Amino acid sequence: VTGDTDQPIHIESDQQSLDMQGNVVTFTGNVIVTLGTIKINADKVVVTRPGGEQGKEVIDGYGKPATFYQMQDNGKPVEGHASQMHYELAKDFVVLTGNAYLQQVDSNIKGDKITYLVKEQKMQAFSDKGKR
Amino acid sequence: VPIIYVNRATXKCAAY
């Protein structure tokens, strides 16, 4: 269920704490993040919001090991890795950076950074300006 | 965003 919105983000983690200001947290211990049947295996994850000021907030994650699963629009499963992942609610996509890899039999992308557009073929090199 | 977080370590959940 949604509005005319982004899908709900799901996180499974082993142990964490909650914020005394209710707005800045972390999720930790062999973590799974799930959205749109994308999977991300992680170790430490972040969610952070300004109480709803300007309606903008962000999601970040790191893994030891990290793995990024998706389906591809051509009806296939896919796997990969990256050193960090990031999302924000006006972007259509999730972005992965530092030491990144994703591959099908049809296509290979690896280097700095990965993004995948869940409607259009613009998976490309976009070599980076900060490991974050 | 609508968020849900769940413990692997207990099998129980909360929305954000």
Can you give the three-state secondary structure of chain B, one letter per residue? CCEEEEECCCCCEEEC
Q: How many residues does chain B have?
A: 16
Is some CB atom of chain A closer than 8 A to the CB atom of B13? no
Cα gap A129→A31, rounded to integer Å: 27
* d(C-alpha B6, C-alpha B10), whole Å: 8
Q: How far is A12 from chain B (nearest CA, A)?
A: 5
Cα–Cα distance, B1 to B16 (Å, whole number): 8
* Cβ atoms of residues A68 and A81 within 8 Å: yes
Name the token pair of A64. Answer: 């030891």
- Are B10 and A12 in contact by the 8 Å Cβ rule? The answer is no
- Min Cα–Cα distance to chain A from B3, Å: 5
Q: Which residue has the tokens 């969610």?
A: A47
Are the C-beta atoms of residues A83 and A66 closer than 8 Å to each other?
A: yes
- The position carrying tokens 């370590």 is B9
Q: Where are the domains of chain A?
A: 1-132
Residue A31's H or E segment, with its range, is strand A24-35
User: Measured between alpha carbons, how far is B15 from A35 in angstroms, rounded to an integer?
Assistant: 15
Does A47 contact B at CB distance below 8 Å? Answer: yes
Q: Which amino acid is at A74?
A: N
CB-nearest partner of A13 from B3, B8, B16: B8
**Interchain contact B7–A (C-beta under 8 A):** yes
Shortest Cα distance, chain A CAs vs residue B11, angstroms: 9
Question: Could you tell me if A45 and A27 are in contact, meaning their C-beta atoms sit under 8 angstroms apart?
Answer: yes
* Out of B2, B3, B5, closest to residue A13 by CB: B5
Q: After which residues is chain B broken (C to N over 2.5 A)?
A: none
- DSSP bridge partners of A97: A84, A113
Phi, psi (5° rounding) for residue A101?
-150, 135
Residues of A in contact with B3 (CB under 8 A): 8-11, 47
